Design a protein around this ligand. Structure first.
Ligand SMILES: NCCCCn1cc(CCn2nc3c(Br)c(Br)c(Br)c(Br)c3n2)nn1
Ligand SMILES: [Cl-]
Length: 331
């Protein structure tokens, strides 16, 4: 008996109703510009599968960010580009400015709009209760859009969220793991970062959807309001589930496994054990209480679910009382 199939509650067939070329990214033709149009100023960091540089466009003298791609399948490069082009102009989505190759190394490079970003290691420790609600709302705008455009991000984490706190603007970046959602498709579970992997990835359930991003959002929200980074601190993919089980309890976990008839890895049986579902007040203490509210806990609780079908959609999340003040001020 194989695993029970699954479909997305929302935006299920959006890609099917679009032209083939929208999602069939393998056939997409790429027009490569010249890297000589950009002069690298300084290195912004050594990314996961790239080298990221701040650069200036010598044509119009404007600051950009050049992301030199590390050698990956051309198929995946076309995917990231096509997804970036499909989402351009969208709310809080990073803007792909250009696509170039170095004249010598012939190495593919992506050029993005610049964002005056403050790292979350320095920023998140300063954010107020409102700041969290505000920026969470901005990410939801991005998630709701890309989900509506038939795209899972599959790598939602603080490092992929550039925040210009001075101008209160937010950009969701790094779409290299993003993929088009098609109903019935079995996806690779080896995506996202370990601390932000959804349970479906940890138990190897391949037929997931947009709701994967909502779990990652939940992990982010938990780490911010509780000031515990990361919230689920596992030492590997297996222990990660154990860390989650020690919070959400093992009862809902095994029910989740039974519902989708998931064949659990033989390793899991001993390390999981038996754990109760903890109350969120346990994580509330003297230093984080000013960020924790009954609305926040209610909203967080509806993001962090084993059953991906039972998690809030992005739009549902935006309509939560947690964001009532934010919505009002944006009018
Ligand atoms: N934990 C120690 C601190 C070092 C880690 N770290 C990572 C970063 C982010 C660097 N960065 N900025 C980017 C901008 Br702006 C754009 Br636009 C794009 Br696209 C990318 Br990819 C960026 N990466 N800071 N500290
Ligand atoms: Cl959604």
């Amino acid at each position: 008996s194989g695993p029970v199939p699954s479909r997305a509650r929302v935006y299920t067939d959006v890609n099917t109703h679009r032209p083939r070329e929208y999602w069939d990214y393998e056939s997409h033709v790429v027009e490569w510009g010249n890297q000589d149009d950009y002069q690298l100023v300084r290195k912004l960091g050594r990314g996961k599968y790239s080298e990221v540089f701040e650069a200036i466009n010598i044509t119009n003298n404007e600051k950009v960010v050049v992301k030199i791609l590390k050698p990956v399948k051309k198929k995946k490069i076309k995917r990231e580009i096509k997804i970036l082009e499909n989402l351009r102009g969208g709310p809080n989505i990073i803007t792909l400015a250009d696509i170039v190759k170095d004249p010598v190394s012939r190495t593919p490079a992506l050029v993005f709009e610049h964002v005056n970003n403050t790292d979350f290691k320095q920023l998140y420790q300063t954010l107020t209760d409102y700041d969290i609600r505000f920026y969470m709302y901005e990410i939801l705008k991005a998630l709701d859009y890309c989900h509506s455009m038939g795209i899972m991000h599959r790598d939602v984490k603080p490092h992929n969220v550039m925040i210009d706190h001075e101008h209160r603007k937010l950009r969701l970046i790094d779409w290299g793991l993003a993929e088009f959602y098609h109903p019935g498709q079995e996806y690779n579970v080896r995506v996202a970062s370990r601390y932000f992997k959804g349970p479906e990835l940890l138990v190897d359930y391949q037929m997931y959807d947009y709701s994967l991003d909502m779990w990652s959002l939940g992990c982010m929200l938990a780490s911010m309001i509780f000031r515990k980074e990361p919230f689920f601190h596992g030492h590997d993919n297996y222990d990660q589930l154990v860390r989650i089980a020690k919070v959400l309890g093992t009862e809902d976990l095994y029910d989740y496994i039974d519902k989708y008839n998931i064949e659990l890895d033989p390793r899991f049986n001993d390390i999981l054990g038996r754990h109760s579902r903890k109350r969120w007040e346990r994580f509330v203490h003297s230093e984080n209480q000013h960020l924790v509210s009954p609305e926040a806990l209610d909203f967080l609780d509806k993001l962090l679910r084993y059953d991906h079908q039972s998690r809030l959609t992005a739009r549902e999340a935006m309509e939560h009382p947690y964001f009532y003040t934010v919505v009002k001020d944006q009018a």
